Assembly symmetry: C4
Homo-oligomer: 259 residues x 4
């Protein structure tokens, strides 16, 4: 019953006090790792002796590395405890939580095994990006988040086809804007993929203003694009809200069945 006791402790933390305190320690270390990742990029100061303003992750590289390795050790010990104390280890490994944990902890091990090629450029940037995934471990630390996830999975097809319609609208508007605006002086509409940016910024009603039409036809089609974006701000809400509310009522009915 040891393995099942440990798995019961992990899966439902509130069942015990030791399990719940280990849960809170794990959540605290997740927050520490996220805050350290965010903070290590802040330029701390001039650091006299160096002209460039070094980030906190380079002026204090050893301290941040110690914090990161403590967090990664905690995460990997937790992962090994979960995997070795699961009713079905393969089912655990294939699960979304497990792959998130592995892809969160694994960049640290690549950085360890790339210590010989310390002059790596670009790949380590992708590894540090993938280190953002440690925030997703807060999914175990919420309940409405899983409700939203189930709602999204139930709206996967509808939202996918809505995105497909949005994509064809993007292509149409980008084509017309590129052809209407390719002739302007020093125009940013240098291609249709270049007008993808303008179209996606216009139909979301951002309007950064870096790419704006400068021709009469371009302005007319930009106005049509804006009006289409007004409807874009209302096309996903009905399906999403209706599906979420249906799930809400169904969950309440399940609760009353259990009661």
């Amino acid at each position: 019953t040891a393995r099942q006791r440990v798995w019961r402790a992990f899966e439902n933390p509130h069942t015990s006090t030791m399990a719940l305190v280990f849960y809170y320690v794990t959540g605290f270390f997740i927050a520490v790792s996220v805050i350290a990742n965010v903070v290590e990029t802040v330029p701390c100061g001039s650091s006299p002796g160096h002209i460039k303003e070094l980030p906190c992750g380079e002026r204090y590289a050893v301290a941040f590395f110690c914090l990161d390795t403590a967090c990664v050790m905690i995460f990997t010990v937790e992962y090994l405890l979960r995997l070795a104390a699961a009713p079905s280890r393969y089912r655990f490994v294939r699960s979304v939580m497990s792959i998130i944990d592995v892809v969160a902890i694994l960049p640290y091990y690549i950085g360890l095994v790339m210590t010989d090629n310390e002059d790596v450029s670009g790949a380590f940037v992708t590894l540090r990006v993938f280190r953002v995934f440690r925030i997703f471990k807060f999914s175990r630390h919420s309940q409405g988040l899983r409700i939203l996830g189930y709602t999204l999975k139930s709206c996967a097809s509808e939202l996918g086809f809505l995105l497909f319609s949005l994509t064809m609208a993007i292509i149409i508007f980008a084509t017309v804007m590129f052809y209407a605006e390719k002739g302007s002086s020093a125009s940013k509409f240098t291609s249709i993929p270049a007008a993808f940016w303008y179209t996606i910024v216009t139909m979301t009603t951002l309007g950064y203003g870096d790419m704006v039409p400068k021709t009469i036809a371009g302005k007319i089609f930009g106005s049509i694009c804006s009006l289409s974006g007004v409807l874009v701000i209302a096309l996903p809400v009905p399906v999403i809200v209706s599906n979420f509310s249906r799930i809400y009522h169904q969950n309440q009915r399940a609760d009353k069945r259990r009661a």
Copy 2:
């Protein structure tokens, strides 16, 4: 029964396997033509021997022309098969799908017959714009798109009058903004059609920022315009959503009648 067999194959592709595979080939060629049209405008590179960075559609003009003519041949053979194997050929020709197909394939034939006047300027740009219509042939490759089309046709009058009210609001706000802002130094509000752009960008809550008021009265009326745009982002949703939901329930009731 040959003509009716071919028309049954075309209209409902899933009835057979040959019809469905020809359907998927046609959809694949539609996607190929759309991607080629989007890509041919991307500047591929310096192309040594030419100072200007030529687009992919001009450095590799022969390859893109071969791809385009293969796609157009497939489309026109499909169109002839559909027209010659229809229960009512005139009804086919007048249909929206047929006119979309014709206006998609016809710019290629104009480009063929304009090969003598290869120095054409402007008209060929419009032809290449109208080549975007090949994306619309994906309408046959969706089911919710037709539901949205029927909903739009049922909301044609309501949305038309809503657009008319939006237009009168645009005219009013453009007039007041032009008269409040015509006196500024190097102002972009050079006319009321010039303020149409500012009004349509403001009431959609884009705010590009190229045209902003610089006078106190201009800023007051721009604030009123912004507040009106807040309501603009909510005026089409009730009619559109209510009509679409009514169509949804009516379709479900039709399904249950058939069941």
Copy 3:
């Protein structure tokens, strides 16, 4: 029965053919006057002999004046016919439609009586602004517009208090943004009324970008302002939509009572 016959012709145009054709002529002249007012500000061309690009309303001043006086004559004859053929003339004069008609036609008569002081500056600009009100005469040429007007009148108190809450939010955010951003170099936050513009542009999710915070505290409070604007885009919709739908159902019930 002459006066009542004329008033029946005016009030319900569809009752006859002469009344309906006079209605359509009046609507056509309203559209002509609106289009002429919009077009007279467009710079037509260089007009050789003058360096400045004169607007259409000044290069062709006599033609636009003739069109304007024809439109004003039609409008004032219509107004006199309505007033002299009304069941209660005072009730007509106090009505909103009558005041709109008078304030639309009256700037022309001021321009006539100000022909001696043709060098007027500023006041004539306000008169030309008030000439925009001729668009509002399209209210008689719609039915859903009156439904929206009744809905607005029924939501007058709720929308007024919502605007009051929006105003107190504007004042709070403008105060905090001004005090956080008054110290920046060449800052646009020169006063709290100056930050009114930033606050109203931010809580409507325009983001023109002319006034942006440049301090950390300013950016924090701008983020709070943006998040508040997200709720601003949803605070008027429930009251407006609920009231409009209640009016819709009540009108349908009235129709069924009459049936």
Copy 4:
């Protein structure tokens, strides 16, 4: 019965005429103080003899100080009357209205006791900011505002977790945008807290345009951020509206129970 008479006069102003007129005087002085605070920052003019354009609160410092001290005297006399004539003085002091009143009136007394250190910098700015809280005393002068406050208190947990999800989305998008855009020339994405601003401006569909991506990966992730903001403009509305409507129906049912 004196204390209870005074407290009944304060709590429900409409019970009497003296209580209601004192209520209206208090509201008028609140509006006077708010308008004076807003106006004292407006640059009145050149004020010959001084090169800088002094604000109204410094060219006319004595008049604004007299107005402010009259308003503060009225507010503190009202506060003492409320506290000394309350059924439970401690319950009054701990109440939200009381702390708002105290923090509104108290900056004036700090300014009095800091008259020796008149060269204070920064702290007095915070005091003048906290003087904005006098607007909140209009909470006693509304009824729907308390309905919104109760609705917010009932949605405190749901909106808090929604803000937490928005925060994790902000962190993820800021990380990816910083790492995609840190390499650009003179990029504003100098850190992840620096990209917090871009992310919060993008997911609210502001698009100021001061920080825009300049790399292909940055533009792709900015497009994803924009699409997420489209859903952000719809995630708080269902919970807020449903809770507010439930409170509405419950209040109507309470009214009918009392009837």
